[PDB]
């Protein structure tokens, strides 16, 4: 049986060309009025995942290339 990928992982993490695992920065979906432009800018890009989290993501992905 083919082993399926994780759907949330499919939707949440990208894998770059060199193999890095990147996610969208968390904390900017709402409640943004009190957040400054500096805080919003800090939460506005992409984050390269740490070693253990990246290994967990590549395990959850079934050879899926991310999104």
């Amino acid at each position: 049986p083919k082993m399926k990928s994780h759907s949330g992982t499919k939707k949440r993490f990208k894998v770059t060309g060199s193999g890095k695992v990147t996610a969208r920065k968390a904390g900017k979906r709402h409640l943004n009025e009190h957040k400054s432009s500096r805080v919003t800018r800090r939460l506005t890009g992409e984050t390269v995942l740490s070693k253990g989290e990246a290994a967990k993501v590549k395990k959850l992905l079934a050879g899926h290339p991310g999104r």
Binding site: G8, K11, R12, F13, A23, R24, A26, R67
Partner: protein, 96 residues
């Protein structure tokens, strides 16, 4: 993750959408065209590159990393502006 909200649920979903009709190009660069067609390669068609390596039955956009001292006439699907400029300056052309 032991009960803590896991990584695949604390991270926001990458949104966006997928183009249902997107078609990828099999890209070839001018260094490859120079290496595989060195001897004044007159006309290079998709059949020729697919004979070397372009993975046939696909579109064959030609890109422009490399110098391309030789003169070539590439009839292919699509090209980059830099590749076209380099090809024309070398003395050749592109078509299709």
């Amino acid at each position: 993750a032991g009960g803590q909200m896991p990584i695949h649920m604390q991270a926001p979903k990458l949104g966006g959408f997928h183009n249902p009709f997107r078609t990828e190009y099999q890209v070839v660069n001018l260094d490859k065209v120079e290496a595989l067609f060195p001897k004044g390669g007159k006309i290079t068609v998709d059949d020729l590159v697919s004979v070397g390596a372009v993975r046939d039955n696909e579109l064959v956009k030609v890109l422009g990393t490399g110098e391309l001292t030789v003169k070539v006439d590439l009839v292919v699907d699509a090209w980059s502006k830099s590749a076209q400029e380099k090809i024309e300056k070398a003395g050749g052309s592109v078509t299709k």
